[PDB]
Amino acid sequence: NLYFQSMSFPPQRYHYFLVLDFEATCDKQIHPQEIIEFPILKLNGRTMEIESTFHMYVQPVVHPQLTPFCTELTGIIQAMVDGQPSLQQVLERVDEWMAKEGLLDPNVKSIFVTCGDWDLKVMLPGQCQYLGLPVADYFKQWINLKKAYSFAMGCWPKNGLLDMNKGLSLQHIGRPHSGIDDCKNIANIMKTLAYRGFIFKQTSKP
Residues near Mg ion (CB under 5 A): 21, 182
What minimum distance in Å lies between the beta carbon of 50 and Mg ion?
Answer: 17
Residue with the shortest CB distance to Mg ion: 182
Q: Does 34 appear as a known binding residue? A: no
Q: Among all residues, which ones are annotated catalytic? A: 23, 177
Residue 55 counted as an annotated binding residue: no
181 is in an annotated binding site: no
Task: Choose between 34 and 182: whose C-beta lies nearer to Mg ion.
Answer: 182
Alpha-carbon gap, residue 69 to 81, rounded angstroms? 15
Give the type of residue at 49.
E
Question: Closest distance between Mg ion and the C-beta of residue 103, in Å?
Answer: 22
95 is in an annotated binding site: no
Rg value, the chain, Cα: 17
- Rank residues 39 and 45 by Cβ distance to Mg ion and give the closer one: 39
Residue of 52, 55, 43 lying closest to 200 (CA atoms): 43
Separation CA 142–CA 20 (nearest Å): 10
Q: How far is the CB of 23 from Mg ion (least distance, A)?
A: 6
Using the minimum distance from each CB to Mg ion, give the nearer residue, 99 or 162. 162
With 0-12 / 13-18 / 19 or more C-beta atoms within 10 angstroms meaning exposed / middle / buried, residue 6 is exposed
Q: Calculate the CA dihedral of residues 178, 181, 183, 185 and round it to 10 degrees.
A: -130
Which residues lie closer than 8 Å to 139 by C-beta, 6 or more apart? 112, 120, 124, 125
Adjacent-strand bridge partners of 71: none
| Helix segments in the chain, DSSP class H | 68-74, 78-81, 87-100, 118, 124-131, 145-153, 161-167, 179-195
**Which of residues 43 and 76 has its CB atom nearest to Mg ion in the complex?**
76
23 is in an annotated binding site: yes
Q: How far is the CB of 180 from Mg ion (least distance, A)?
A: 9
Binding residues are: 21, 23, 119, 177, 182
Question: Binding-site residues for Mg(2+), please?
Answer: 21, 23, 119, 182
Residues making up the binding site for AMP: 23, 177
